[PDB]
């Protein structure tokens, strides 16, 4: 990694700009990287391209909550833990990755309300069953689900599924006066 890190180090010379306080974007796609050295020395990075690699986990974002958009697709990433301590993410690319501990992810995702977009095609959820409505029930605050915006049909059937008490509320508070029709 440090052998190729020179190009990132050269970025100040590439743009001819000032100093390390200028960190905003970082791109390392198509370099089969697996793990990154601890990025807690850098500065207010908000855009990150680390897709098209062989990344697995995160041991480098210890205080890199300053990120706002993260692009980690087409990898072998299995790690979403402690990321809740970095809740400033708004858009995330994650397609072709390995996330299966979905309830713990949601527990992490409960602190990641800031996310506006997320991509999940070819992720295990895209290949699962009872997937999209489960996510919507867990995440009403995420709009671009697989970047595909939610529709009212999915919301309706999700409401019918997940809260049976609320479903009978829907049937009863309107009228639900007699049973057989």
């Amino acid at each position: 990694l440090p052998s190729s890190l020179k190009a990132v180090e050269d970025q100040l010379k590439i743009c001819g700009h000032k100093r390390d306080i200028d960190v905003l974007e970082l791109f390392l796609s198509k370099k089969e990287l697996t793990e990154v050295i601890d990025l807690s020395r850098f500065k207010k990075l908000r855009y990150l391209w680390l897709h098209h690699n062989k990344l697995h986990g995160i041991s480098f974002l210890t205080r890199n909550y300053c990120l706002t958009e993260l692009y980690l697709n087409n990898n072998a990433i299995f790690e979403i833990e402690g990321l809740h301590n970095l809740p400033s993410l708004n858009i995330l690319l994650l397609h072709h990755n390995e996330l299966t501990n979905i309830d713990a992810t949601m527990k992490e995702l409960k602190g990641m309300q800031n996310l506006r977009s997320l991509s999940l095609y070819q992720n295990p959820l895209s290949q699962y069953n009872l997937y999209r409505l489960y996510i919507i029930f867990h995440l009403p605050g995420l709009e671009l689900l697989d970047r595909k915006q939610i529709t009212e049909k999915e919301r309706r059937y999700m409401i019918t599924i997940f809260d049976h008490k609320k479903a009978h509320v829907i049937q009863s508070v309107a009228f639900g006066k007699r049973v057989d029709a």
Partner: peptide, 29 residues
């Protein structure tokens, strides 16, 4: 949708291209 989705994927590819373009612009700056 199918067509839409695909077209949406193409739009995503185009946006990636534009992001690369912006990266190039920043490098130039």
């Amino acid at each position: 949708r199918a067509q839409e989705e695909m077209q949406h994927w193409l739009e995503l590819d185009q946006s990636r291209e534009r992001r690369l373009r912006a990266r190039q612009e920043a490098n130039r700056t």
